[model samples]
Target: MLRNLKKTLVLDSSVFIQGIDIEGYTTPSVVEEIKDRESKIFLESLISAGKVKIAEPSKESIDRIIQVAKETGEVNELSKADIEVLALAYELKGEIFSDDYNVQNIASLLGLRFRTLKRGIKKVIKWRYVCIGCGRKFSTLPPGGVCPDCGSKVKLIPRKR
Candidate 1:
């Protein structure tokens, strides 16, 4: 319903796994996520045809996204491929083509355009960590998700803002 990805489509690994053949760009990190036999072969041929090209986003962009992801408390929720996909979009100013919940939230926070292949996140969230034992809420997560005060597991709570 919106002009979200008319220009360049920044693809995630899931797009390939689903066998979506539309032309787009992705990173080496995401390329590694293609595991299905046919999907992997399809991606290889697509690269050979020079339609879906690979990328190496700048370190600055990568770091920026990491910080944003951290603030959003989605840092651990993402993978190397997920982070790189957002970084590539940051550098290229292209749309984030993904269906990952964390990916969509981070993309929204970074003011980048995105189009999910499937259902998208209803709203952007600013997550907070809560101690499962002490019922204490923390803006920043404890190290290793273990609460400092109670030595119990820390849980990520998503709060829409």
Candidate 2:
């Protein structure tokens, strides 16, 4: 297998929930927001593999999130978690892999390189999911089980737009 040059990336809880294996990347505070068992397990596996990195939030990045939240009228969305991810990316000067359009936009605006894995970062693909009950979003692959969202079973509802 030709190894694509590995790169450091920061993750959002959304990425973890999707079972994307963004192992070499870090996850900051936002992970607390996730409310799924499989997602947590995936994180654990990443950590066990010595690929997951945890980083501290920088004051400067927090300030940026606060300011941006105000401008976007999003008092809670992506608030600190996204900020920390951005900070880590900036600190490492590496790419950010996410499926979030909002994060993608912010990263782009900040002159940061980012790729959405669900859209195929290269030839590899990751799945993204949304909870039908709480309207929460995440990603995951059941090792041959049911959907973690509503337990109504899972299917690859691939992006069509």
Candidate 3:
């Protein structure tokens, strides 16, 4: 493993909505994603204090998001939080601090680095997959069609790490 030269992370909407003090950002979509008024106030305060800055997705980010989304079949359809975080990381060329396996996998696949706040801090550099039909998961890449266990067509969602 290589030592990371910088220590900045782009946060996802889920982090704020879940009330984690992720250090680098406070995106508008994050607020919009929070339906409850009470939590919005807390996030809004962070925004006012200049502690969090909202960032826009760039062309590189948008393209990466699309590619990752398509590969996972969750697309833009399943994970709003993933999109925003990836967008920020893409624009900055920094790292993403997220707990999402899909996002971690995509970032690693692109040779981008990311951190997860689980079991004290971990880095991911590969992805895995599972079958919804049998609930059987595998670390290796899938065969690209039906589940071996139940023989049902697999939808190719990102594997849980």
Best by TM-score: 1
Query: What's model 3's TM-score?
Result: 0.58
Which candidate would rank higher by TM-score, 1 or 3? 1
Model 3: per-residue Cα lDDT over 16-112, one tens digit each: 5556664676556656668776567766776776556777666677777788668767666646656766777877787776666576677776667
Span of 10 residues, lowest total lDDT, candidate 1:
118-127
Model 3 scores a C-alpha lDDT of: 0.66
What is the Cα root-mean-square deviation between model 2 and the actual structure?
Answer: 13.6
Q: Candidate 2: minimum summed lDDT over ten consecutive residues — where? A: 129-138
Quote the lDDT for 110 in model 2. 71
Model 1, position 130, has a per-residue lDDT of: 89
Instruction: Extract clashing residue pairs from model 1.
Output: none
How well does each candidate superpose onto the true structure, as a TM-score? 0.65, 0.59, 0.58
Residue-by-residue lDDT tens digits, candidate 1, 1-161: 54233477778787777777767787887666677788788889988876777886889988998787788776766678878878888888877777776776788899998776764356734558889989877878778978888899988887635
lDDT string, candidate 2, 1-161, tens digits: 65443667677666786678655566557666766899888887777766677775567766665666667676467656677777677766777777765687677667788767645454545556544454444466564535454575444555634
Candidate 2 deviant stretches above 4 angstroms: 1-5, 65-78, 119-161
